[PDB]
Amino acid sequence: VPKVGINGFGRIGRVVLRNALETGAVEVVALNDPFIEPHYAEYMFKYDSTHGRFKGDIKVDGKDLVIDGKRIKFYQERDPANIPWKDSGAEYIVESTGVFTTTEKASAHFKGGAKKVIISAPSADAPMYVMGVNEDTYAGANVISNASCTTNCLAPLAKTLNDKFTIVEGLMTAIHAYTASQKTVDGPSSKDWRGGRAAAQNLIPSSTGAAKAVGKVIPELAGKVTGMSVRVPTVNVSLVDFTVRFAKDVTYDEVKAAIKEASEGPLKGILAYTEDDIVSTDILTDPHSSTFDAKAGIALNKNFVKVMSWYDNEYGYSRRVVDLIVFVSKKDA
Amino acid sequence: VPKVGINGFGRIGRVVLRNALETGAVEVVALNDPFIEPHYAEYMFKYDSTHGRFKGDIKVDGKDLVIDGKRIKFYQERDPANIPWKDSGAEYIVESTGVFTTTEKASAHFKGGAKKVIISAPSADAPMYVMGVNEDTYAGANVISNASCTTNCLAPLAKTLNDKFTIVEGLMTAIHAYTASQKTVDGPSSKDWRGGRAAAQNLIPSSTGAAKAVGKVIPELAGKVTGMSVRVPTVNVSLVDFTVRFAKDVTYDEVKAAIKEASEGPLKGILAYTEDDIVSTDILTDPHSSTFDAKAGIALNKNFVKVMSWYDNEYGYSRRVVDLIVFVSKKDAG
Amino acid sequence: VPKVGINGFGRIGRVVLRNALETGAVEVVALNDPFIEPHYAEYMFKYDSTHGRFKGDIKVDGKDLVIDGKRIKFYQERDPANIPWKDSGAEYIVESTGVFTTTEKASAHFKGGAKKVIISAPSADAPMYVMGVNEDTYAGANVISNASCTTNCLAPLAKTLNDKFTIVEGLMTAIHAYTASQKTVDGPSSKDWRGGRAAAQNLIPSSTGAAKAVGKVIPELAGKVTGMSVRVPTVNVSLVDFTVRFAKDVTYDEVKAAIKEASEGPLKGILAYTEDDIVSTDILTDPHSSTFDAKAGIALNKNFVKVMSWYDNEYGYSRRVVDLIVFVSKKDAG
Amino acid sequence: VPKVGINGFGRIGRVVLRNALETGAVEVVALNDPFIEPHYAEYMFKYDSTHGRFKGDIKVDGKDLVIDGKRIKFYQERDPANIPWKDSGAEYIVESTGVFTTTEKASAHFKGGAKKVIISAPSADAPMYVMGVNEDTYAGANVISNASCTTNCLAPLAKTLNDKFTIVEGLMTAIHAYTASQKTVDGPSSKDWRGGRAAAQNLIPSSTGAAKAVGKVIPELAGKVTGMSVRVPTVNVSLVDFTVRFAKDVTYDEVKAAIKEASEGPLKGILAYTEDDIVSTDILTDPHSSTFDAKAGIALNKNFVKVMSWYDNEYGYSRRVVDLIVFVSKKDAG
Ligand SMILES: NC(=O)c1ccc[n+]([C@@H]2O[C@H](COP(=O)([O-])OP(=O)(O)OC[C@H]3O[C@@H](n4cnc5c(N)ncnc54)[C@H](O)[C@@H]3O)[C@@H](O)[C@H]2O)c1
Ligand SMILES: NC(=O)c1ccc[n+]([C@@H]2O[C@H](COP(=O)([O-])OP(=O)(O)OC[C@H]3O[C@@H](n4cnc5c(N)ncnc54)[C@H](O)[C@@H]3O)[C@@H](O)[C@H]2O)c1
Ligand SMILES: NC(=O)c1ccc[n+]([C@@H]2O[C@H](COP(=O)([O-])OP(=O)(O)OC[C@H]3O[C@@H](n4cnc5c(N)ncnc54)[C@H](O)[C@@H]3O)[C@@H](O)[C@H]2O)c1
Ligand SMILES: NC(=O)c1ccc[n+]([C@@H]2O[C@H](COP(=O)([O-])OP(=O)(O)OC[C@H]3O[C@@H](n4cnc5c(N)ncnc54)[C@H](O)[C@@H]3O)[C@@H](O)[C@H]2O)c1
């Protein structure tokens, strides 16, 4: 199985490691985060406000972590060029700092001997992939992106609807949990002015390319889909709200059938289908990219419908990072 | 000038009272709520988790409330047929209990001498009005409805866009603060299973007739608009998300100009226009029905747009209740 | 293995069922809740905003629930005297509705054939027990009380410190999650004015007898301990803050060693001891009554100390309900 | 009136500016914050999630702010030694960055022409003052501290009780709103592991010198008071929980009378007294240091009592900064 390094031991970094240990699909052999010392890393991994306590064994030994018997090297370099990935055999680097999302910045990991870099975020210039949507277009690039949590929710849904019914145009709102880039109380934000307002007290509109990025992993939809997001006071779990017009005449039951069929077939494990009366906490720690909520949507007429899909923005995306490393390593061989 | 009675001294009942006192546009002379004694009512009106402390004077004087030197009768009748509205001269009754929303149930207020009843909610069998949209169609019905907060947000915006660009079809999501019918922890809500889950910890989808009701106050949009709601962990203030297709070709700048124009003219005080980077707390205790957020919307192409508009679901709607009573009282006088 | 019926399928009722299934220490064979139909009951038990999804299997078969293959009768009786506990063999009845906490009202279960009633709350007159503190004083009463979540947190801690150091006097604050009796938005609470204010937006002082009740389960502490609570914006998990004066001289390390010793011996599974840097979510779904937080306390001097102890007010208490039934059934048989 | 500069336009800096404008007691003529450009500063000041919209008028002119007609210079210097305070005549500097809390660091402001520096936080090596407690001990130090929000709450209460009843010993818990140092989701806080956990989902214990500092502003209480903090999911407003033993015998009514008397005389505007059933939001934007909550406290016996006092940790503290500057300016002038 691929040997993995994680740069940035944050929400995504720690949850990617949970998914690695849970599945065994990759072997995380090295960790880097200059703002966290090894003993502190043990604390942050063991206790989690969102996904509950870690259920395995973890201890510090020397400057390293030991998790269920396996040693993980822990470094504290601010410059990714100084991380010696080769000492542990770390070949596939998860770049989850949030500060090295361009190909140039991410490519620093090759200095320490990395083989591939997976940016855990959209990138201005690295090719983006969404498992179940366009992984087969992978063509060997050294630095790649797994897009965003929101794109991983919308794109499997949009691909399925387009294939069956032909999307003419669509607009998305992502009703999204607050994240680490937001603030407890009103303070300065680097992304945008609204982004700094008290996270747990506000609905906060936020612009996003993640719906437009659907048009890059699904070229047939370029220029046909865009949208925005509203950050809301939940610590985790988000909801895609997708209003879309089809070329074909559909009923809503036919929309549901198309989703159900994809969830039981080509997108099983990626796109789920439910008719239960679920709320956001029911999707906590669920590893799907996208769970279509049959009862939450509505059709106005035979061509114009609203559909809704849930995603654990931390947990589903993080499993997809693992899935994308496994797939790319197969192709590289 | 119009003398008002309020049945149900809840979020809407009390916030209607603050708007009456703030504007002086109506004189509230009587209140009824069987689950609040007069001393408790003073406390509930004095302190408010959402809109801050009442800035005036209030005291209890023997079963009555006195606010800024004016006596307000206070009753505790479970049956609205037993409220002697005539004793205080209350003629226009705000029916804001949530349990008397039909013409039959709301008509009980006439037994005690009410002249008109305004149901603070959509109604199955009473005409619905949205100020700035269709109040001129009022023709003397004795039981009327002020619709919902959400319809009061969407309809003035849809009217403006329809008038200027012709709406082909539109779908709405109301991202809505939690309310009194929701629960702190997972509890029974047998008629709305999701609505029983812990309110401040969940995103909670809900169906709503509020967008379809836009096609009832704007008959030209009948069959062209519907939508749903998502209840979210805020104590107040909500956000309409409107995805709409126009028959005419538009730029987003043209959409903004149409809204700004209406806000500076025929819908002043009802529909506001902003380009500021606001968030929900900035709309707290704002009396507009609808505040169009120009930087939050987006146009995909020349006919297909998503626009967003804020509303204080408590304070905007409550000011409209006062506005509607004034308007109807004037019409009842000629 | 005792056969249990649960009356009131609420937070405590459902979490008691979770604890019964998790441990197998009792067999829940019947449930009653008039406000929940069987298909709704499956939903409310399957999905939980606080403790997550149920990991086993559950379905409805006819009017019953089937959980992990076992059939569980489900009734919908408003009057507990009409619940036919006998049909399923239910002998030990968890009275978790919140509304039948006196012996007079709780005794209604005996009509349907109950053998014992455990009130999931303090009782005005039924004897109260805290596992680890006074269950040996149980003498065969047919209606008993498992006290409150807070008493179950404070009393095992107070007993240990009293046994070792002699408590002269103590005052407690329970920093407590909000509960089902609180309100999402400012609402009517005629017997607890503060308790009606928006739960997720306020710190809400509240008086409690739960610290004085430590004086009933530990009679030597009668009149030496009381306190109050503050209800805070968390959906679950609470924290006892105990400020206490000892007759003996102690260091804070001796305080810690006494609690660690108790946690490894006589109070294992009831009182836990930690030096970790935990926060409230770390105690979610933790079955202990009391988790002493070593780093959160502080000593002013050799006789005056502040200790703090965590408790999942739903899950800890609910496991104690299961433990108490087990203990009492053993006593009933020898 | 004194001319003021503010280094650090954060929660305290902006709420200090609001208090200066509200009272006119000082004239703010310059601001510095390298992370907030002028147009961003206008937005952050105009719109506040906690205290609401700014009521006055504000605009940017070039690189400076203009607020209600007066120009305010705005700099973005990361090194306070480079702020040209003299250009605007700013003499009294509010040091509210959180990062220059020592006499050596705060002294950087003198390079730019400042006359006095008031650190908006406790300091390891500058004298701390609490208005109503020890401001008369000021004797011309050039770098002073206004202590913390929590010490400004506890000290006036502790002085009053100790003056009348003699405090033998006391322990405090500050139930405290979360602040800008905390995190929205679990993130790094290597000096305070608990302080990194999701602020709005957790109760978070924390050590604090704020209770011990009461023994520094009140030397007669040295060694007799300490405590800790629990950070909770509110955006603002905190609650002091003070458990104290007196040397004299007292009733609770006598405790109440002593607090009320102080609130009406020497501590007016500093310590408030209430018997209302208030909750945290009722203290929002209240400028008192300390609001004694009569009904929330409890006496165990004639010497052992728990008292509770509310404080808007942003607004009360900020008004005290303004008050301290006024007082120091008058003493500086004779
Ligand atoms: N949280 C989500 O829902 C989510 C979902 C999908 C993608 N993402 C993306 O994943 C990335 C990480 O997000 P997050 O939520 O985990 O953020 P986070 O703040 O929780 O974690 C980022 C971590 O990177 C560390 N770091 C900072 N500078 C560093 C450096 N120079 N070298 C190494 N480590 C450094 C920080 O200490 C922190 O622990 C971001 O790009 C984000 O946009 C986040
Ligand atoms: N809250 C909102 O945002 C909002 C906005 C627009 C409209 N509304 C509508 O306004 C109505 C009231 O909503 P609310 O949020 O104020 O609810 P609420 O629960 O806060 O208020 C209801 C009040 O009615 C009282 N009441 C109950 N039974 C009564 C009776 N028999 N006689 C007299 N009074 C009685 C209750 O004691 C309570 O004080 C509802 O129909 C709601 O749909 C609410
Ligand atoms: N939640 C806690 O933290 C906690 C902890 C310890 C003890 N308790 C006590 O346990 C009891 C239950 O509390 P809860 O938090 O589970 O409340 P809850 O509201 O979650 O549960 C009450 C349940 O009882 C049902 N009920 C109402 N009337 C009934 C009737 N006549 N017959 C049968 N069922 C009826 C309701 O439908 C509801 O499902 C209360 O007395 C409470 O004080 C609660
Ligand atoms: N918030 C409270 O309740 C409270 C109460 C009393 C005291 N305090 C104290 O006041 C101080 C500020 O607290 P806050 O809550 O306002 O924090 P905050 O983060 O809201 O404000 C800090 C401000 O200082 C600015 N800043 C950072 N580095 C700077 C530099 N080199 N030069 C100039 N400005 C810089 C930041 O941009 C930010 O605007 C802290 O010392 C805090 O302990 C806070």
Automatic annotation (TrEMBL), chain A:
Coiled coil segments of this chain: none
Keyword Membrane: no
Keyword Thylakoid recorded: no
Key words, A-Z: Glycolysis, NAD, Nucleotide-binding, Oxidoreductase
Entries under Pfam families matching the protein: Gp_dh_C, Gp_dh_N
GO biological-process terms attached to the record: glucose metabolic process; glycolytic process
List of residues binding D-glyceraldehyde 3-phosphate: S148, C149, T150, T179, T208, G209, R231
Catalysed transformations (reactions): D-glyceraldehyde 3-phosphate + phosphate + NAD(+) = (2R)-3-phospho-glyceroyl phosphate + NADH + H(+)
Binding locations of NAD(+): R11, I12, D33, R78, S120, N313
Marked site positions, Activates thiol group during catalysis: H176
Residues of the active site: C149 (nucleophile)
Pathway it works in: Carbohydrate degradation; glycolysis; pyruvate from D-glyceraldehyde 3-phosphate: step 1/5
Enzyme class per UniProt: oxidoreductase
Protein EC: 1.2.1.12
GO terms of molecular function: glyceraldehyde-3-phosphate dehydrogenase (NAD+) (phosphorylating) activity; NAD binding; NADP binding
SMART domains named in the record: Gp_dh_N
Assembly and interaction partners: Homotetramer.
Family statement drawn from the similarity comment of this UniProt entry: Belongs to the glyceraldehyde-3-phosphate dehydrogenase family.
UniProt cross-references to NCBIfam families, sorted A to Z: GAPDH-I (TIGR01534)
Protein name: Glyceraldehyde-3-phosphate dehydrogenase
Source species of the chain: Hypocrea virens (strain Gv29-8 / FGSC 10586)
UniProtKB/TrEMBL annotation, chains B, C, D:
Binding-site list for NAD(+): R11, I12, D33, R78, S120, N313
Residues at the catalytic site: C149
Domain of life: Eukaryota
Gene3D superfamilies cross-referenced by the UniProt entry: Dihydrodipicolinate Reductase, domain 2, NAD(P)-binding Rossmann-like Domain
CDD domains associated with the record: GAPDH_I_C (cd18126), GAPDH_I_N (cd05214)
An example Gene Ontology CC term for this record: cytosol
Pathway per the UniProt entry: Carbohydrate degradation; glycolysis; pyruvate from D-glyceraldehyde 3-phosphate: step 1/5
GO molecular-function terms, A-Z: glyceraldehyde-3-phosphate dehydrogenase (NAD+) (phosphorylating) activity; NAD binding; NADP binding
Domain named Glyceraldehyde 3-phosphate dehydrogenase NAD(P) binding: residues: 2-149
InterPro entries given in the database record: GlycerAld/Erythrose_P_DH, GlycerAld_3-P_DH_AS, GlycerAld_3-P_DH_cat, GlycerAld_3-P_DH_NAD(P)-bd, Glyceraldehyde-3-P_DH_1, NAD(P)-bd_dom_sf
Residues the entry annotates as binding D-glyceraldehyde 3-phosphate: S148, C149, T150, T179, T208, G209, R231
UniProtKB keywords: Glycolysis, NAD, Nucleotide-binding, Oxidoreductase
EC numbers on record: 1.2.1.12
Reactions catalysed according to its record: D-glyceraldehyde 3-phosphate + phosphate + NAD(+) = (2R)-3-phospho-glyceroyl phosphate + NADH + H(+)
Residues carrying the site annotation Activates thiol group during catalysis: H176
Gene Ontology BP annotations: glucose metabolic process; glycolytic process
Enzyme category, top tier: oxidoreductase
SUPFAM superfamilies named among the record's database cross-references: Glyceraldehyde-3-phosphate dehydrogenase-like, C-terminal domain, NAD(P)-binding Rossmann-fold domains
Membership in a protein family: Belongs to the glyceraldehyde-3-phosphate dehydrogenase family.
NCBIfam families linked: GAPDH-I
Oligomer and partners: Homotetramer.
Stated name of the protein: Glyceraldehyde-3-phosphate dehydrogenase
Source species: Hypocrea virens (strain Gv29-8 / FGSC 10586)
Record lineage: Eukaryota, Fungi, Dikarya, Ascomycota, Pezizomycotina
